[PDB]
Design a protein around this ligand. Structure first.
Ligand SMILES: *[C@@H]1O[C@H](CO)[C@@H](O[C@@H]2O[C@H](CO)[C@@H](O[C@@H]3O[C@H](CO)[C@@H](O)[C@H](O[C@H]4O[C@H](CO)[C@@H](O)[C@H](O)[C@@H]4O)[C@@H]3O)[C@H](O)[C@H]2NC(C)=O)[C@H](O)[C@H]1NC(C)=O
Ligand SMILES: *[C@@H]1O[C@H](CO)[C@@H](O[C@@H]2O[C@H](CO)[C@@H](O[C@@H]3O[C@H](CO)[C@@H](O)[C@H](O[C@H]4O[C@H](CO)[C@@H](O)[C@H](O)[C@@H]4O)[C@@H]3O)[C@H](O)[C@H]2NC(C)=O)[C@H](O)[C@H]1NC(C)=O
Ligand SMILES: *[C@@H]1O[C@H](CO)[C@@H](O[C@@H]2O[C@H](CO)[C@@H](O)[C@H](O)[C@H]2NC(C)=O)[C@H](O)[C@H]1NC(C)=O
Ligand SMILES: *[C@@H]1O[C@H](CO)[C@@H](O)[C@H](O)[C@H]1NC(C)=O
Ligand SMILES: *[C@@H]1O[C@H](CO)[C@@H](O)[C@H](O)[C@H]1NC(C)=O
Ligand SMILES: *[C@@H]1O[C@H](CO)[C@@H](O)[C@H](O)[C@H]1NC(C)=O
Ligand SMILES: OC[C@H]1O[C@H](O)[C@H](O)[C@@H](O)[C@H]1O
Ligand SMILES: OC[C@H]1O[C@H](O)[C@H](O)[C@@H](O)[C@H]1O
Ligand SMILES: OC[C@H]1O[C@H](O)[C@H](O)[C@@H](O)[C@H]1O
Ligand SMILES: OC[C@H]1O[C@H](O)[C@H](O)[C@@H](O)[C@H]1O
Lengths: 395, 394
């Protein structure tokens, strides 16, 4: 989308996976969806260095709204869970140097059952612009036809544009087209900053794999459309929660960087392990994600329960991810000829290889004819940065 | 099996899940299957308090043997990887106060492709007993028929008995039956100390769940056959490895205790996190597993992605496990009437409830009529001990 936004993938925090549609502030004041929840996250996004790592969008997902529009036809913040309304909350966030994200639906209702924006796109756009919203996740639920789907999405895109305010526009458009409807990514790209392609993530290795596989399987179709201002969204980072082994967390962090995915953490910033924080704030990995060339990576090859993914980076450098998919035994030795990497350019005449995950370690120079041996934990990933020796010498 | 063994579920360590059939000692001397591997584990089983927690069987799984029987038709330790042979290794293990487990197969070949025991049951039983083996895992691979399967298993059972040596006998009999037909556990129980029911575990939550679910589904046929001298084997504890979140590890430790499963860790004792160690050596949980009454627990109820399991313990006590099966969101609140627990006796008139996992914490006295509220992490488990208050009078 040509709104000057999301020149690199958008980073931030989104409540959904972690917190869902929890409306019980009486029994569960600390994890029901409320202005309090977001304010707490906002403080911690600053105090815990999340803002500095690049996480800047604090995003409200579904179930922030009251059950109907006000007498002027505007969506309303739930009166008991957002007593000071969205404006004040946006103000709060802005005072922190962060930006605010919000959630709406293209159809008659949000997925949770709250007011959809169908028939209110302009009102809703204007409402969001005025509150000072900076990002909108626009979901596909409760849409009667694909014609409508496509229209609503395009309409909201213009409606937002017309408000004159910069708002990152996130469209679940393509996801609601799958499996039998080949979405037009050229068209989607034009209206959206990023787009959800596939099913909702959750706190499981199953789900991660499902996403990785769906992505690689569908790669020719989607990798090349992605770039500055328009990204493929494989959903929230779920690192730091409950259902992932450490190795699996690493794999997500690694692969989301390779895939140039937006980085929306969904977790409790109040209770997050020093490791998780370290991984999610990993500055070399984040740099790979945020590489300014903005070229999404791909699966290079797979077999014997290994996968190799690689991503071209600015400076003719390359990210390389090696995933051990075998879920039994111990660290498994993997060997690849550096010649195969970076379509044979990465390491010609040589390349310097730095390992980034699971730990940062310099591995030195590999001539183009040489082989790289790794040991990769079951469900883990080794992330690598290749520096071509030629470009290195150049200052 | 009436050999006086496994009066409580057998505890120990088994190489397979962690180490598999790794035959490359040249490229991987520290994790190929060798006498060195087992000796290291044996020292650590002592030095790291594993023996004291109750882990006493050091077990060799598949790929210890050479590719043929010697001229006397005996199974042989791989000459390169077990240069001093099994005898010396058993001696070593015994000197530590530990016992040795070994692996054979009822068919023509072990699963990995090495010599099976079909046609050599007596020879093999005698070979093991000679060496000083104390436990045999007997696998089901490469068997032509179920008739044979059943026979080989019964034969090895007697063959072992005839050697006169105490050997825990572990049979994968029922697991290789389930594909073809319903296994007779009365029969199995007669010949075996424990038995693998299900598919192989691995380093995944997917696999644990599949095991828990398969068991709960089939609990009618299997829970009651289990008892002193004869146990259901839901396979190795994989805690402390790579593919499980902490909550999932907790769930395995909890549920294997509820299930009165044998406890065979499969991990690297050389590199195991303080936490894993602590969980696996958790002495209140191990006590529940090792409860002398030897009654296996069961799933009590399930729904809304919660499961409640419970197990009767001696002293009219009860273990209760609550599993949060919902794999999205955060800790989820669960509430049960203590009246439902322990077929309405556990808490009548009252019970004192101790939480054991994820952390140990005294919850207090609960009347018959009261409700217990918990918060359980996604894929986690809360493990509970209930003491009936009448018993704390006495
Ligand atoms: C509403 O929609 C309109 C129409 O699509 C949209 O207008 C577009 O805005 C973008 C971004 O501001 C314009 O692109 C710019 O064009 C100028 C001049 O040609 C360039 O110099 C700009 O360069 C920037 O981007 C570089 C990275 O590529 C940076 O390095 C540099 O520093 C600059 O920041 C930039 O490419 C685009 O031309 C217009 N299109 C039209 C037809 O006018 C508008 O932004 C939307 N409004 C809102 C609020 O969403
Ligand atoms: C070969 O197979 C035979 C037959 O299956 C098997 O003989 C059995 O050995 C068991 C275990 O030693 C005997 O059971 C015990 O018998 C004595 C004497 O009657 C009892 O005191 C025992 O009662 C209990 O108390 C003990 C407390 O210390 C416990 O250890 C015990 O588990 C009981 O709770 C116990 O019942 C049994 O008598 C014979 N059975 C027959 C029919 O002979 C033999 O052990 C096998 N050999 C090998 C080496 O495996
Ligand atoms: C996918 O949609 C895009 C955008 O609507 C299409 O590309 C445009 O096609 C129109 C004609 O319908 C042309 O006027 C434009 O020149 C095209 N845009 C650009 C910038 O190339 C595209 O045809 C669609 N693809 C398919 C296969 O339907
Ligand atoms: C919502 O409901 C109306 C009334 O039935 C229907 O005509 C309209 O097309 C629906 N909108 C969408 C996008 O599903
Ligand atoms: C072992 O192989 C032989 C020869 O092929 C066969 O006759 C015999 O029945 C097999 N036994 C088992 C238990 O599979
Ligand atoms: C189990 O097998 C035994 C043979 O040892 C037999 O006597 C008995 O009838 C079988 N029990 C059932 C329930 O089929
Ligand atoms: O109901 C809210 C929920 O709706 C859809 O399923 C989206 O894909 C989720 O990410 C979340 O926004
Ligand atoms: O460079 C883009 C291009 O790179 C590789 O060849 C991939 O297989 C393609 O799917 C595409 O992503
Ligand atoms: O090859 C060894 C392997 O053999 C079978 O598959 C068993 O069920 C496993 O637990 C393991 O012992
Ligand atoms: O006490 C044993 C008995 O307990 C419960 O009722 C289970 O549903 C049965 O399958 C059986 O295990």
């Amino acid at each position: 989308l040509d709104n000057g936004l999301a020149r690199t993938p958008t980073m931030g925090w989104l409540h959904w996976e972690r917190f869902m549609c929890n409306l019980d502030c009486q029994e569960e004041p600390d994890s029901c969806i409320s202005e309090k929840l977001f304010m707490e996250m906002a403080e911690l996004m600053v105090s815990e260095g999340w803002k500095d790592a690049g996480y800047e969008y604090l995003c409200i997902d579904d179930c922030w709204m009251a059950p109907q529009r006000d007498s002027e036809g505007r969506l309303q913040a739930d009166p008991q869970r957002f007593p000071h309304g969205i404006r004040q909350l946006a103000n709060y966030v802005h005072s922190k140097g962060l930006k605010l994200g919000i959630y709406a639906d293209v159809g008659n209702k949000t997925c949770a059952g709250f007011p959809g924006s169908f028939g209110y796109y302009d009102i809703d756009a204007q409402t969001f612009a005025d509150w000072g919203v900076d990002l909108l996740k626009f979901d596909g639920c409760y849409c009667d036809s694909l014609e409508n789907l496509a229209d609503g999405y395009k309409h909201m895109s213009l409606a937002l544009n017309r408000t004159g305010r910069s708002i990152v526009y996130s469209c679940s458009w393509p996801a609601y087209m799958w499996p039998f409807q080949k979405p037009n990514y050229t068209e989607i790209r034009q209206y959206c900053n990023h787009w959800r392609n596939f099913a909702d993530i959750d706190d499981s290795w199953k789900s991660i794999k499902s996403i990785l596989d769906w992505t690689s399987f569908n790669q020719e179709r989607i990798v090349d459309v992605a770039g500055p201002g328009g990204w493929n969204d494989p959903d929230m980072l779920v690192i730091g929660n409950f259902g992932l082994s450490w190795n699996q967390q690493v794999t997500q962090m690694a692969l989301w960087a390779i895939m140039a995915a937006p980085l929306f953490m969904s977790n409790d910033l109040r209770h997050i392990s020093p490791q998780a924080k370290a991984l999610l704030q990993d500055k070399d990995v984040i740099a790979i994600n945020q590489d300014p060339l903005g070229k999404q990576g791909y699966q290079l090859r797979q077999g014997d329960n290994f996968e190799v993914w690689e991503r071209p980076l600015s400076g003719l450098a390359w990210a390389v991810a090696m995933i051990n998919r075998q879920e039994i035994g111990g660290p498994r030795s993997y060997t690849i000829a550096v010649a195969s990497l970076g379509k044979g350019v990465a390491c010609n005449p040589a390349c310097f290889i730095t390992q980034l995950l699971p730990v940062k370690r310099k591995l030195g120079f590999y001539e183009w004819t040489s082989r790289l041996r790794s040991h990769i934990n079951p469900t883990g990933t080794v992330l690598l940065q290749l520096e071509n020796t030629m470009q290195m010498s150049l200052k």
